[PDB]
Structure formats: structure tokens, C-alpha cells
XYZ file of C-alpha atoms in Angstrom:
720
model
C 0.270 18.966 -71.454
C 2.792 16.654 -69.948
C 2.868 12.852 -70.580
C 2.301 11.077 -67.299
C 2.766 7.404 -68.525
C 6.503 7.426 -68.681
C 9.020 5.250 -66.841
C 10.181 6.167 -63.347
C 13.387 4.480 -64.633
C 14.814 1.272 -66.238
C 17.203 0.525 -63.407
C 17.632 -3.215 -63.250
C 16.495 -4.347 -59.885
C 18.568 -7.571 -60.032
C 21.378 -5.133 -58.773
C 19.689 -4.876 -55.475
C 17.441 -7.854 -55.049
C 18.339 -11.606 -55.460
C 16.594 -12.845 -58.569
C 13.992 -15.758 -58.468
C 11.496 -17.086 -60.820
C 8.003 -17.254 -59.188
C 6.894 -20.867 -58.241
C 3.259 -20.494 -59.104
C 2.992 -20.167 -62.693
C 0.078 -18.839 -65.015
C -1.224 -22.040 -66.392
C -3.505 -20.893 -69.288
C -1.090 -17.999 -70.400
C 0.095 -17.840 -74.046
C 3.593 -17.415 -73.038
C 5.099 -16.542 -76.346
C 3.414 -13.196 -76.986
C 6.056 -11.402 -74.789
C 3.518 -10.385 -72.332
C 3.410 -10.127 -68.548
C 0.649 -11.888 -66.629
C -0.883 -9.284 -64.250
C -1.347 -10.391 -60.543
C -3.830 -7.880 -59.209
C -6.073 -7.400 -62.175
C -9.755 -8.117 -62.991
C -8.477 -10.541 -65.607
C -6.356 -12.505 -63.272
C -8.683 -15.456 -62.582
C -8.423 -16.251 -66.351
C -4.859 -17.486 -66.096
C -5.407 -20.205 -63.497
C -7.774 -23.120 -62.465
C -10.396 -22.328 -59.882
C -12.486 -24.403 -57.338
C -15.172 -26.103 -59.417
C -14.688 -23.667 -62.191
C -16.583 -20.936 -60.312
C -13.897 -18.160 -60.233
C -15.733 -15.140 -61.833
C -14.200 -12.709 -64.298
C -16.129 -9.339 -64.157
C -15.798 -7.099 -67.134
C -19.080 -5.432 -65.922
C -22.060 -5.163 -66.344
C -21.518 -8.835 -67.332
C -20.062 -11.464 -64.958
C -18.478 -14.359 -66.615
C -17.625 -17.932 -65.532
C -15.757 -20.551 -67.476
C -16.884 -24.249 -67.496
C -18.861 -24.096 -64.427
C -21.434 -26.851 -63.850
C -21.779 -30.630 -63.676
C -20.102 -31.094 -66.988
C -23.134 -31.509 -69.176
C -22.599 -28.533 -71.426
C -19.753 -26.419 -70.342
C -19.106 -23.034 -72.011
C -19.009 -19.294 -71.145
C -21.676 -18.657 -68.320
C -23.102 -15.301 -68.221
C -24.508 -13.638 -65.189
C -26.064 -10.008 -65.161
C -27.265 -9.429 -61.869
C -30.346 -7.154 -61.860
C -30.783 -7.565 -58.002
C -28.604 -8.464 -54.989
C -28.781 -10.628 -52.046
C -28.412 -8.756 -48.760
C -27.597 -10.593 -45.503
C -26.328 -9.995 -41.978
C -24.960 -11.881 -38.884
C -25.960 -11.875 -35.324
C -23.599 -9.789 -33.002
C -20.603 -11.390 -31.202
C -19.954 -8.627 -28.642
C -22.266 -5.907 -27.496
C -22.154 -3.085 -29.966
C -25.293 -1.797 -31.840
C -26.723 -4.085 -34.461
C -25.784 -4.129 -38.148
C -28.918 -4.208 -40.686
C -26.857 -5.581 -43.637
C -23.522 -7.075 -43.082
C -22.972 -8.058 -46.799
C -24.139 -7.699 -50.395
C -23.685 -10.674 -52.863
C -24.545 -11.673 -56.443
C -26.430 -15.063 -56.919
C -24.402 -17.722 -58.789
C -26.982 -18.343 -61.694
C -26.551 -19.405 -65.256
C -28.593 -16.522 -66.936
C -27.184 -17.600 -70.218
C -24.446 -19.715 -71.468
C -22.585 -19.718 -74.808
C -21.365 -23.404 -75.532
C -21.371 -25.886 -78.328
C -23.115 -29.338 -78.936
C -19.705 -30.833 -79.636
C -18.808 -29.971 -76.037
C -21.462 -32.108 -74.515
C -19.803 -34.109 -71.618
C -16.385 -33.086 -72.525
C -13.799 -30.518 -70.949
C -13.011 -27.662 -73.320
C -9.328 -26.499 -73.369
C -8.536 -22.945 -72.114
C -6.272 -20.191 -73.210
C -5.675 -16.683 -72.597
C -4.312 -15.776 -75.997
C -3.859 -11.984 -75.537
C -4.656 -9.275 -72.886
C -3.987 -5.713 -71.924
C -4.925 -3.459 -68.971
C -8.558 -3.440 -70.298
C -9.046 -6.614 -71.812
C -8.368 -10.485 -72.468
C -8.967 -12.673 -75.327
C -10.195 -15.929 -73.915
C -10.088 -19.114 -76.252
C -12.283 -22.022 -75.315
C -11.381 -24.952 -77.733
C -12.390 -28.588 -78.182
C -9.774 -30.645 -76.227
C -7.011 -31.797 -78.404
C -8.724 -30.290 -81.598
C -7.608 -26.583 -81.500
C -9.210 -25.890 -84.839
C -12.713 -25.923 -83.319
C -12.961 -22.971 -80.889
C -14.543 -19.886 -79.607
C -12.703 -16.641 -79.220
C -14.062 -14.210 -76.483
C -12.653 -10.710 -76.618
C -13.485 -9.824 -73.007
C -13.615 -6.036 -72.451
C -14.332 -3.659 -69.642
C -17.779 -2.161 -69.964
C -18.749 -4.244 -73.003
C -22.439 -4.102 -73.841
C -22.457 -7.385 -75.537
C -20.591 -10.789 -74.925
C -18.741 -11.508 -78.278
C -17.939 -15.076 -79.332
C -16.066 -15.656 -82.457
C -17.116 -19.407 -83.364
C -14.936 -21.548 -85.429
C -16.185 -24.940 -86.791
C -18.462 -25.441 -83.916
C -22.278 -25.991 -83.391
C -23.556 -22.935 -81.338
C -25.738 -23.913 -78.269
C -27.300 -21.345 -75.844
C -28.383 -22.618 -72.541
C -29.989 -21.274 -69.410
C -30.468 -22.339 -65.765
C -33.790 -20.442 -66.236
C -36.530 -21.498 -68.652
C -36.354 -19.846 -72.166
C -39.995 -18.861 -72.600
C -40.004 -16.965 -75.777
C -37.993 -17.010 -79.024
C -38.219 -14.457 -81.868
C -36.127 -14.789 -84.914
C -35.406 -11.913 -87.351
C -38.321 -10.076 -85.702
C -40.884 -12.468 -87.350
C -43.637 -12.304 -85.019
C -46.533 -14.504 -86.544
C -45.005 -18.112 -87.223
C -46.943 -21.224 -86.427
C -43.621 -23.020 -85.928
C -42.731 -22.993 -82.143
C -39.934 -25.591 -82.308
C -37.315 -24.081 -84.658
C -36.102 -20.621 -85.545
C -33.934 -19.233 -88.482
C -32.128 -15.977 -88.982
C -29.429 -13.703 -87.622
C -31.298 -12.290 -84.752
C -32.914 -14.028 -81.819
C -34.626 -12.109 -79.162
C -35.209 -14.574 -76.089
C -36.901 -14.266 -72.790
C -36.338 -16.042 -69.424
C -38.850 -16.938 -66.763
C -36.538 -15.396 -64.062
C -37.512 -12.397 -61.773
C -37.040 -9.709 -62.865
C -37.540 -10.856 -66.466
C -34.288 -11.139 -68.594
C -34.294 -10.557 -72.214
C -31.417 -11.365 -74.362
C -30.664 -10.772 -78.197
C -28.382 -13.126 -80.097
C -27.037 -11.619 -83.063
C -25.131 -13.965 -85.458
C -22.961 -11.785 -87.630
C -21.367 -14.447 -89.937
C -22.719 -14.615 -93.373
C -24.819 -17.892 -92.884
C -28.039 -17.588 -90.852
C -28.395 -19.758 -87.735
C -30.869 -22.407 -87.361
C -31.901 -22.979 -83.743
C -34.167 -25.496 -82.343
C -35.784 -25.054 -78.813
C -34.440 -28.457 -77.689
C -36.050 -28.126 -74.268
C -37.166 -25.187 -71.969
C -33.540 -24.380 -71.254
C -31.844 -24.974 -74.501
C -31.517 -23.475 -78.129
C -29.224 -25.649 -80.240
C -28.147 -25.165 -83.866
C -28.080 -27.976 -86.234
C -24.679 -27.830 -87.657
C -21.123 -26.241 -87.346
C -20.928 -22.487 -87.561
C -17.978 -20.175 -88.252
C -18.386 -16.438 -87.358
C -19.218 -13.898 -84.658
C -22.142 -14.230 -82.524
C -22.809 -11.521 -80.090
C -25.337 -11.559 -77.186
C -26.486 -8.569 -75.020
C -28.936 -8.288 -72.273
C -31.804 -5.722 -73.436
C -32.408 -3.447 -70.383
C -35.778 -2.206 -71.629
C -37.660 -2.339 -74.974
C -37.023 1.187 -75.821
C -33.161 0.167 -76.284
C -33.626 -2.649 -78.660
C -32.794 -0.499 -81.868
C -29.787 1.095 -79.973
C -28.528 -2.665 -79.454
C -29.461 -3.295 -83.237
C -27.408 -0.427 -84.315
C -24.279 -1.148 -82.362
C -23.985 -4.974 -83.019
C -21.419 -4.740 -85.815
C -18.718 -3.067 -83.622
C -17.182 -4.712 -80.659
C -14.194 -3.849 -78.437
C -10.919 -5.939 -78.525
C -9.070 -3.932 -76.126
C -8.026 -0.255 -75.432
C -4.943 1.961 -75.062
C -4.723 4.197 -72.080
C -2.791 7.523 -71.947
C -2.712 10.389 -69.461
C -1.552 13.914 -69.372
C -1.338 16.926 -66.900
C -2.422 20.378 -67.991
C -1.659 23.988 -67.386
C -4.345 24.722 -64.799
C -3.285 22.053 -62.248
C -5.449 19.405 -63.584
C -4.924 16.054 -65.277
C -6.846 13.769 -67.652
C -6.610 10.194 -68.719
C -7.913 8.754 -72.038
C -9.081 5.365 -73.003
C -8.889 4.850 -76.747
C -10.923 1.617 -77.264
C -9.682 -0.833 -79.848
C -12.603 -2.160 -82.325
C -12.993 -4.420 -85.158
C -14.242 -1.718 -87.438
C -15.162 1.824 -87.678
C -18.542 1.058 -89.209
C -20.292 2.785 -86.063
C -19.297 4.220 -82.853
C -18.739 1.952 -80.076
C -21.486 1.460 -77.383
C -19.746 0.965 -73.838
C -21.133 0.710 -70.218
C -19.604 3.305 -67.885
C -19.307 3.417 -64.089
C -20.971 6.313 -62.121
C -17.629 8.037 -61.594
C -16.899 7.954 -65.329
C -20.215 9.952 -65.817
C -19.010 12.593 -63.306
C -15.575 12.982 -64.730
C -15.964 12.317 -68.495
C -15.633 14.962 -71.285
C -18.947 15.010 -73.157
C -17.633 16.591 -76.340
C -16.940 13.515 -78.321
C -19.145 10.923 -76.445
C -22.904 10.593 -76.502
C -24.761 9.356 -73.197
C -27.900 6.967 -73.555
C -30.451 6.266 -70.877
C -29.486 2.705 -71.272
C -28.417 1.227 -67.801
C -27.552 -2.119 -66.277
C -26.502 -3.049 -62.743
C -22.666 -3.575 -62.297
C -21.737 -6.361 -59.731
C -20.664 -4.040 -56.964
C -20.537 -0.419 -58.224
C -24.196 0.369 -58.770
C -25.705 1.211 -62.081
C -23.809 1.489 -65.385
C -24.847 3.757 -68.036
C -24.014 3.074 -71.818
C -22.032 5.706 -73.673
C -21.433 5.996 -77.297
C -18.068 6.769 -78.711
C -14.602 5.109 -79.371
C -12.615 7.378 -77.068
C -13.244 8.417 -73.394
C -11.374 11.303 -71.855
C -11.886 11.402 -67.960
C -10.722 14.683 -66.303
C -9.605 15.585 -62.824
C -9.542 19.393 -62.458
C -9.002 19.698 -58.581
C -5.768 17.897 -57.819
C -4.746 17.733 -54.141
C -2.461 20.622 -52.941
C -1.053 18.438 -50.116
C 2.704 17.947 -49.942
C 4.718 17.180 -46.680
C 2.658 19.163 -44.132
C -0.788 20.159 -43.052
C -2.068 22.993 -45.287
C -1.743 25.129 -41.949
C 1.762 24.117 -41.082
C 1.938 26.037 -37.734
C -0.290 24.701 -34.929
C -2.365 26.899 -32.583
C 0.458 28.603 -30.574
C -1.032 27.259 -27.279
C -0.173 23.814 -28.139
C 3.603 24.160 -29.244
C 4.815 23.302 -25.821
C 2.610 20.325 -25.264
C 3.582 18.991 -28.876
C 7.188 19.527 -28.032
C 6.972 17.464 -24.793
C 5.232 14.553 -26.615
C 7.599 14.722 -29.436
C 10.504 14.466 -27.099
C 8.922 11.379 -25.444
C 8.182 9.942 -28.910
C 11.828 10.143 -30.033
C 13.028 8.437 -26.978
C 11.044 5.381 -28.066
C 13.085 2.184 -28.715
C 13.179 2.462 -32.669
C 14.546 -1.088 -33.039
C 11.822 -2.625 -31.030
C 8.976 -0.569 -32.971
C 10.464 -0.702 -36.702
C 12.308 -4.104 -36.578
C 9.263 -6.448 -36.534
C 8.654 -9.880 -37.930
C 7.153 -8.533 -40.996
C 7.711 -5.622 -43.375
C 4.191 -4.317 -42.806
C 4.296 -3.363 -39.188
C 7.934 -2.470 -39.458
C 6.808 0.102 -42.155
C 3.964 1.409 -40.015
C 6.693 2.026 -37.340
C 9.105 3.613 -39.856
C 6.528 6.055 -41.227
C 5.335 7.179 -37.861
C 8.756 8.088 -36.832
C 9.481 9.548 -40.226
C 6.674 12.096 -39.539
C 8.446 13.312 -36.474
C 11.631 13.835 -38.262
C 9.765 15.736 -40.951
C 7.978 18.128 -38.677
C 10.981 18.835 -36.582
C 13.149 19.465 -39.700
C 10.649 21.740 -41.320
C 10.519 23.923 -38.143
C 10.551 27.275 -40.216
C 6.936 26.109 -41.153
C 5.979 24.047 -38.169
C 7.298 26.263 -35.480
C 8.472 22.999 -33.807
C 12.048 24.225 -33.182
C 14.505 21.854 -31.405
C 17.359 21.201 -33.715
C 19.141 18.759 -31.470
C 15.904 16.777 -31.540
C 15.405 17.368 -35.106
C 18.947 15.998 -35.660
C 18.330 12.744 -33.386
C 15.025 12.287 -34.992
C 16.499 12.210 -38.625
C 19.714 10.226 -37.392
C 17.580 7.302 -35.553
C 15.155 7.354 -38.569
C 18.069 6.648 -40.826
C 19.495 3.958 -38.597
C 16.183 2.235 -38.353
C 15.774 2.418 -42.076
C 19.151 1.430 -43.388
C 18.568 -2.371 -42.880
C 15.515 -2.201 -45.267
C 17.720 -0.182 -47.656
C 20.344 -2.848 -47.603
C 17.854 -5.620 -48.013
C 18.935 -7.258 -44.770
C 15.710 -6.866 -42.810
C 14.153 -9.937 -41.190
C 11.973 -10.430 -44.354
C 14.137 -9.255 -47.419
C 12.872 -9.000 -50.859
C 13.516 -10.849 -54.302
C 13.176 -9.816 -57.843
C 10.618 -11.965 -59.631
C 11.466 -12.618 -63.443
C 8.186 -14.158 -63.977
C 5.578 -11.765 -62.931
C 8.241 -8.937 -63.142
C 7.911 -7.487 -59.439
C 9.369 -7.669 -56.029
C 8.276 -10.250 -53.502
C 9.024 -11.066 -49.906
C 11.095 -13.983 -49.102
C 8.732 -15.434 -46.328
C 6.041 -16.699 -48.632
C 8.342 -18.459 -51.163
C 8.999 -22.132 -50.975
C 11.468 -23.911 -48.496
C 14.164 -24.210 -51.333
C 14.076 -20.446 -51.688
C 14.578 -19.914 -48.032
C 10.770 -19.144 -47.344
C 8.361 -20.706 -45.031
C 6.261 -22.188 -48.077
C 3.179 -20.509 -46.489
C 1.673 -18.100 -49.155
C -0.143 -16.072 -46.468
C 3.265 -15.224 -44.902
C 3.921 -11.495 -44.971
C 0.165 -11.170 -45.485
C 0.602 -12.747 -48.959
C 3.192 -10.261 -50.321
C 5.033 -13.115 -51.967
C 2.023 -13.892 -54.011
C 1.654 -10.156 -54.740
C -1.128 -9.333 -52.382
C -1.036 -5.696 -50.619
C 2.172 -4.452 -52.295
C 0.683 -0.775 -52.395
C -0.018 -1.140 -48.622
C 3.281 -2.435 -47.676
C 5.593 -0.351 -49.990
C 3.785 2.887 -49.383
C 5.223 3.218 -45.713
C 8.801 2.627 -47.151
C 8.352 5.067 -50.030
C 7.036 7.710 -47.649
C 9.921 7.153 -45.243
C 12.438 7.130 -48.087
C 10.947 10.320 -49.665
C 11.173 12.127 -46.253
C 14.906 11.057 -45.788
C 15.834 12.002 -49.259
C 14.004 15.400 -48.800
C 16.072 16.285 -45.526
C 19.258 14.596 -46.717
C 19.585 14.310 -50.535
C 23.081 12.880 -50.611
C 22.540 10.259 -47.947
C 23.154 6.850 -49.854
C 21.774 8.568 -52.682
C 22.242 6.081 -55.597
C 21.098 3.056 -53.519
C 18.198 4.968 -51.889
C 16.923 6.124 -55.247
C 17.261 2.683 -56.966
C 15.617 0.908 -54.166
C 12.767 3.360 -53.327
C 12.044 3.639 -57.244
C 12.075 -0.145 -57.425
C 9.182 -0.318 -54.910
C 7.352 2.404 -56.861
C 7.773 0.674 -60.022
C 6.607 -2.603 -58.537
C 3.398 -0.979 -57.576
C 2.722 1.475 -60.295
C 4.944 1.478 -63.319
C 3.271 3.491 -66.059
C 5.316 2.444 -68.991
C 6.541 -0.575 -70.863
C 9.894 1.170 -71.382
C 10.381 0.058 -67.912
C 11.110 -3.660 -68.932
C 11.707 -5.047 -65.474
C 8.186 -4.180 -64.027
C 4.520 -5.105 -65.008
C 2.529 -1.928 -65.749
C -0.028 -0.674 -62.961
C 0.114 -3.740 -60.913
C -2.139 -2.295 -58.177
C -4.075 0.305 -60.083
C -7.209 -0.244 -62.212
C -7.986 2.718 -64.746
C -11.269 1.337 -65.463
C -12.451 0.767 -61.770
C -10.605 3.985 -60.955
C -9.100 2.535 -57.794
C -6.596 0.022 -56.694
C -6.918 -3.805 -55.980
C -4.977 -5.322 -53.044
C -5.660 -9.153 -53.469
C -3.125 -11.022 -55.556
C -2.316 -14.453 -56.990
C -4.987 -16.681 -55.386
C -4.465 -20.542 -56.066
C -7.637 -22.231 -56.846
C -9.214 -18.754 -57.649
C -10.408 -15.573 -56.085
C -14.079 -16.630 -56.010
C -15.360 -13.127 -55.433
C -12.896 -11.586 -57.788
C -10.247 -8.859 -56.860
C -10.581 -7.367 -53.335
C -9.539 -4.121 -51.564
C -9.956 -3.258 -47.870
C -7.753 -0.210 -46.825
C -8.447 2.826 -48.835
C -6.019 4.887 -46.644
C -2.962 2.613 -47.220
C -3.435 2.897 -50.991
C -3.706 6.476 -50.691
C -0.602 6.485 -48.563
C 1.193 4.677 -51.316
C 0.267 7.361 -53.919
C 0.934 10.166 -51.593
C 4.340 8.545 -50.973
C 4.781 8.380 -54.618
C 4.002 12.176 -54.874
C 6.589 12.971 -52.007
C 9.198 10.907 -54.018
C 8.371 12.877 -57.020
C 8.747 16.290 -55.026
C 12.125 15.021 -53.408
C 13.594 13.946 -56.729
C 12.047 16.784 -59.004
C 10.131 14.260 -61.084
C 7.188 16.201 -62.437
C 5.676 13.410 -64.267
C 5.666 11.078 -61.083
C 4.140 13.744 -58.872
C 1.429 14.590 -61.321
C 0.813 10.950 -62.078
C 0.289 10.377 -58.411
C -1.824 13.343 -58.021
C -4.103 12.079 -60.786
C -4.353 8.750 -59.243
C -5.253 10.386 -55.769
C -7.956 12.526 -57.344
C -9.466 9.325 -59.057
C -9.283 7.618 -55.780
C -11.113 10.304 -54.001
C -13.860 10.216 -56.480
C -14.460 6.388 -56.498
C -13.936 6.557 -52.789
C -17.155 8.417 -52.497
C -18.881 6.725 -55.261
C -18.439 3.240 -53.994
C -16.615 2.989 -50.643
C -17.390 5.657 -48.039
C -21.322 6.333 -48.563
C -22.852 9.771 -47.869
C -26.627 9.587 -47.368
C -28.284 9.413 -50.832
C -25.560 7.419 -52.380
C -27.348 5.843 -55.637
C -24.960 2.883 -55.837
C -25.899 0.984 -52.797
C -29.374 0.317 -51.129
C -30.355 2.312 -48.117
C -29.365 -0.337 -45.559
C -25.873 -0.697 -46.864
C -25.479 3.038 -47.234
C -26.304 3.256 -43.534
C -23.110 1.362 -42.754
C -21.055 4.447 -44.113
C -17.999 2.311 -45.153
C -18.289 -0.565 -47.569
C -15.927 -3.131 -45.516
C -14.018 -5.438 -47.603
C -14.698 -4.480 -51.358
C -14.709 -7.240 -53.806
C -15.552 -7.523 -57.715
C -18.647 -9.714 -56.867
C -19.463 -8.835 -53.271
C -19.199 -6.401 -50.436
C -18.756 -7.542 -46.786
C -19.200 -5.177 -43.759
C -16.364 -6.862 -41.798
C -12.574 -6.825 -41.562
C -10.098 -9.772 -42.035
C -9.551 -9.362 -38.472
C -13.260 -9.683 -37.555
C -16.752 -8.241 -37.661
C -16.086 -5.566 -35.204
C -17.267 -1.948 -35.660
C -14.249 0.207 -34.533
C -11.982 -2.064 -36.690
C -14.120 -1.853 -39.844
C -14.351 1.966 -39.653
C -11.072 2.344 -38.242
C -9.029 0.641 -41.060
C -10.302 3.432 -43.296
C -8.965 5.949 -40.907
C -5.137 5.067 -40.738
C -2.496 5.967 -41.338
C -3.501 9.652 -40.713
C -1.454 11.892 -42.957
C -2.069 15.381 -44.478
C -3.333 13.617 -47.643
C -5.804 11.651 -45.719
C -6.765 14.496 -43.395
C -6.687 17.638 -45.753
C -7.972 16.060 -48.895
C -9.253 12.300 -49.020
C -11.380 12.187 -45.806
C -14.059 15.018 -46.129
C -15.401 16.658 -42.989
C -18.955 15.867 -44.404
C -18.377 12.291 -44.564
C -16.634 12.155 -41.269
C -19.602 13.930 -39.550
C -22.137 11.614 -41.248
C -20.067 8.519 -40.178
C -19.700 9.903 -36.582
C -23.336 10.556 -36.162
C -24.608 7.410 -37.613
C -21.993 4.827 -36.034
C -18.904 6.185 -34.214
C -20.196 8.701 -31.818
C -22.010 6.120 -29.806
C -19.075 3.676 -29.512
C -16.092 6.064 -29.354
C -16.185 6.884 -25.633
C -16.327 3.143 -24.737
C -13.439 1.970 -26.817
C -10.386 1.090 -24.548
C -7.916 -0.050 -27.245
C -5.569 1.694 -29.829
C -8.568 2.044 -32.010
C -9.513 4.935 -29.728
C -6.521 6.941 -30.896
C -7.535 6.231 -34.505
C -11.147 7.030 -33.994
C -10.350 10.378 -32.191
C -7.610 11.546 -34.525
C -10.402 10.911 -37.381
C -12.828 12.970 -35.173
C -10.162 15.855 -34.917
C -11.339 16.370 -38.672
C -14.736 17.704 -37.371
C -14.077 18.457 -33.821
C -10.279 19.119 -33.296
C -11.047 21.102 -30.031
C -12.477 18.173 -28.266
C -10.323 15.398 -30.042
C -7.193 17.118 -28.744
C -7.809 16.386 -24.958
C -8.945 12.881 -25.957
C -5.774 12.343 -27.837
C -3.741 13.205 -24.819
C -5.202 10.179 -23.118
C -6.101 7.353 -25.374
C -4.037 4.572 -26.701
C -2.132 5.116 -30.054
C -2.434 2.875 -32.995
C 1.127 1.227 -33.653
C 1.603 3.362 -36.669
C 0.446 6.401 -34.585
C 2.256 8.707 -32.369
C 0.749 11.002 -29.733
C 2.809 13.973 -30.735
C 2.090 13.653 -34.462
C -1.613 13.145 -33.464
C -1.650 16.372 -31.404
C 0.204 18.239 -34.179
C -2.343 17.195 -36.793
C -5.306 18.175 -34.621
C -3.791 21.447 -33.480
C -3.113 22.193 -37.147
C -6.919 22.065 -37.933
C -7.836 25.677 -38.696
C -11.041 25.220 -36.523
C -9.097 24.067 -33.668
C -9.590 26.197 -30.440
C -9.514 25.824 -26.720
C -13.078 24.777 -25.145
């Protein structure tokens, strides 16, 4: 097959964007290993301080915190949530009530690895190394670097691995430790001290937690039950100690068998195949090849993985927000996607029902006579981008009249020319909020959120946090789509500049190779989670981890990337984007858009149909704008493109969502969300969506003409 992890290019973005160094630096990063600190990664919190040391890092199924607590015995705190906390809020307007408005994980010290030497002191912290799937976190005695613990923190790890170095191991819990068994010695009269290299312990929590501590160093541990919550060794220790939660008795030997091998990272590759499929492969890095690796897997892993070189166990543990994980045996995972999207520029049925063509033409006329400057030159790049794309669609469908049957060449010409005039200022980096190239985190950033001395407002929420690397896929997706459409219709128009600029945006979001030395790799994509993260650098910590709200705007980025691939004949880019869109679809229906029967959420959450704002540690049935229904569900319905309508949003889910929630509120919505909702509705009922779309308000990234065109190109459209 063909390699998908190759550079888009190694074009130097300093030629287009004024160079800066980002003002907010990664405090705990080893700066000399030549590596780029990721901004939108599951490991990102590790690099910075956090409010009360509570920022969580979530390899899954373990949740980890660092040096949390009152200062008594700080270390690495482990939480493995068997159960969730569900809550709600009272209504604020009159819409039907919500049963469960959120899902959280309690902040509890299930178990903590620390040392007696760290009593009442503040250990030093360093991220010594990291890759897409891991980070090595070193906690050391302050100003005594020779006494430390290395924690290889890796996605899916079934144990917590701690390389102790000249330190006295201490294990504490917020729970009571109510049983200790050493080296499987059942009948000892001594209830106070325990010796050996295996310690099975139980807590008095609910449900009952059972942990096993393996000491893998040569010298056996001698632990004293100092009190109901503390096990303490007597002298300094040097060697690897691993602790695993035991999900059930029948799995103990499994954990015994896999204790000598731990992950230290992983290498990711991806290839397309002959039969219009693609795959990606994780090759876990381990300390040894003594036994095969034991690693926990998300649900979508299970549905997409190649079973030929991996063995499934029945061993399961709850992830923080993705439902049950299932342990898999093997050092190499290959995940396959065999049904890649067929969507390109247009609806799969490019020509609308004949009886609508005139109607659509009338509307398209009106839509093109819009004031483009007013609707595409906004305060911020985000809404500007929405406007640009919405007009780009009109230009596209007029200029593919052979397929769309929307023939009006004068209008086609004007649509493209106005699109170009509206777009050019962004191409020239002379829009209201121009970009900068950041040499620190290797990406592009809006000027607006930078400090005063750089010409910014010094408000890091400016441009919705773009300057601190939030929401880049969202913002840059619109510009990449518009650029691809222009370059498709007019390949020589500002070709060099258009290509370098557009590809800079693409590389900023989704660089797949370190041969591109100017951009961090996969800023917004997570190959383990199988979706994208939006939330970027968060001073004082992202206390619920990474977040993502809009699935369609991520989708819209990768669709844009695909379109750019098609417009430039870049097969690896096109296939990469296709693969990421497929994985996106998969995880979208595993975790975000919930069909009845979904096993990763309780019934009352599934009943919400969408997950709301999705975090690593919590899910919230709300929006950043507010806890309003049409917003919550609507955000997952725009921008409506052939990718969203033909491939990502299935009629089955649209149906379930409509019957469960939206059908009752839609006729009462007197806002632009009505346009969003009914265009969404066109997926299951285009015949009735169509007259509604003739009347209701359009979202600011939506046009009436494009809406009618998408509805009329549903195969089951008809006249009622």
C-alpha cells in the first residue's frame, strides 16, 4: 500500500507569516531532547503547573494526578473510576426537561505512589521524553535529582509503572487499606509487616478496589501497614514497581503473567490499500520481549482491529469517558477502515430534482448579491471563515453545472470572482486578525491573543483562544475548504502563494511527518482516542483534560484536507484525510452521537443523543454558549456539507435524535437554529424540510440556496 504519514511539504512558513516565539512556555519540558511540546494532546497538562495540582492526565483506564493534596505525602495519584457521578440542572427557558446534564469522575485518591522521603516536601517535576502515545514523567526529590521516580505513562497501560531510584516506597490511599497479602502467603500471624515482591491489597471503597503491587527489582520490599491508609517501606529502594487494578479474581494470573513487560511509548504508521480502504498501526515500544504486551483498548479499537496478531481477554476496566476498555495481548495493533467516504465536492446525486432547479437558481442569485465584505470580513477569522465557505459552496455548484444542472455562467463567474475578492485578504495575511508563525510550539497563531508587545490584546480568549492553540481545526477547516474550491476552479490563480498558505494551515492542524520540520505532528488528531481535540494551552491546567465540542467542524477540516488533496493531486493527503474521516465516524457513534443501546453510556445519558461538550474526564450536556437544546444539538449539525450529509450523519441517528428530542421543539424555534435543524431534517425528510427551508432563518454559515440544493439532491426528495 501507499504511505500516509508523509509531509504535505517542508515549505518555510516564515516566508508568509511574521515569526514569533510563544509567550507561554512549557515549564516542565526537557528542552534539550529536540522535541516539540504538543498543545492539544492528552499529555499536555504534564508540561505546566495546575490549580491545586489537580490537572488530570488520562492514559486510560487510569486517571493520574501529580502532587495533589495538602502536602503531607505528594506523589503520583491514581484514580480508576468504576462508577460515574450523574447530575442535572433546572431549566432556564421552557423546553422539555433534561434527565442527566452531565457525567463526571470523582476526584479520589484510590492509590498513590510516593516516598517517605517526600513527607511535607514538594517533589520536582520533569517531562523527560514523550511521543504521540506516551510521556515519561520524572518526580524527583527537590534539589536532589539522584533520588527520583520515572513514570512511563502510556496510552492504554494496564499497570502504572514506577522506576524508583534511591527512594523509600510509600503507597497511600484516601480509602482504608483493609487487606494485604504478600507473595500469596495466606496464613501469617503477622498483620503489621509484609515482605516480598507481590502485594495484593483491597480498599474499603464501593465497589471494592483490589490493587496488586509488583516490585520487579532484585531486592524484595518490606512494607509496614503504618495506618489504615498507608503502606510504607523501611529503607530506600531502586527498581521498577508496577501497580495494576485487578478487575476480577479470574484475571489475577493474567496480571501476574504480564508484569515484567511495560510500554515505554509507541510508533504509529498508516497506509492505504488497493480496495479503497486504509489502516493505521501502533507498534508499542516495550522494555523487553519476554512476554507479549497487555494493553487496554477502547471499544472502537475492538470493532476496527485486525485479530490475526492480537489476543482478546475478557478483562475490562471503565475508561474515564469512553465506556469500558478491554485488555488485548500483543505488541502491535493494526486498526482498519475498509469503507472510506466516496464524497468529494458534491452530493452523491449532483443533480437536484428537476422541479427545484428554478427555485434554487432564484435563491442562488439572491445569495450571490449578498454584501460579501460585510459577511466574510468579520472581527475574527472564525465567522469570516464560516461566511467564506458558505459563499464558496455557491461558487462550486455553479461552476460544476455539468453535474449540478445549475447553469448560469455569468453568475458562475461572478460567484467565483466575488469569492476570490473576499478571500484574497486572508491569503495576503492582511485580514483583521492576521497570523503569526510560532517557533516554540511549531504552528501558526492569531495575533489577537498575543501580548500587547506583539500587537495583540493580551486576552488569550481572543479569536476563541486560537493564539493559545485552541480550535485550529475548526477555524482553519473553513479556509482550507474555500482555498481548495478556488484552486479546483482556477488552478493558476495566485498558485504558489495559495498553495504555500493553504498547506501551512493544513500542516498546522495535521502534519503527519517530522520531515516537516516547521510543524508539530498531528496537533489536533489523537490516534489512540480516534478523534480530534479542540482545547489548547490552558494556563493553570485543563482540569477536566482535553475537550472537543463540534464534530462537524473537525469533519469539515478533514473534508477540506481531502479537497485540497484532490485539487493538487496529492494522493497521500487525500487518503490520510479519508482515513481520519472514517475513524472520526466510528468514534463519533461510539462516544458522541448515541444510538439507543449504546454500551458506553448509561441510559439517561444515551437519551440525550449527543454527548455535549466532550472532555477526557467529564461530559456536559451543554454548549459554551449555554445549556440550550437547539444549540446543543445544532452545533453537531453545521456546517452542512456533502461530507456531513452523505457520510458522517447517518439517517438512522438523525431519525432517533429527531424522535427523541428535536421534533417537538423544531416548529417553535424562531432563530437561525431553525435553518440548521431543518437542513439536518432534510436527511430523513427532505420532502418536508424543503418548504421549511424556504422560510426559516439561515445560520450565518448557511445559505438558503445551498440548503435547498442539498435537500433537493436527497434521492428520496419528492413533492408532497
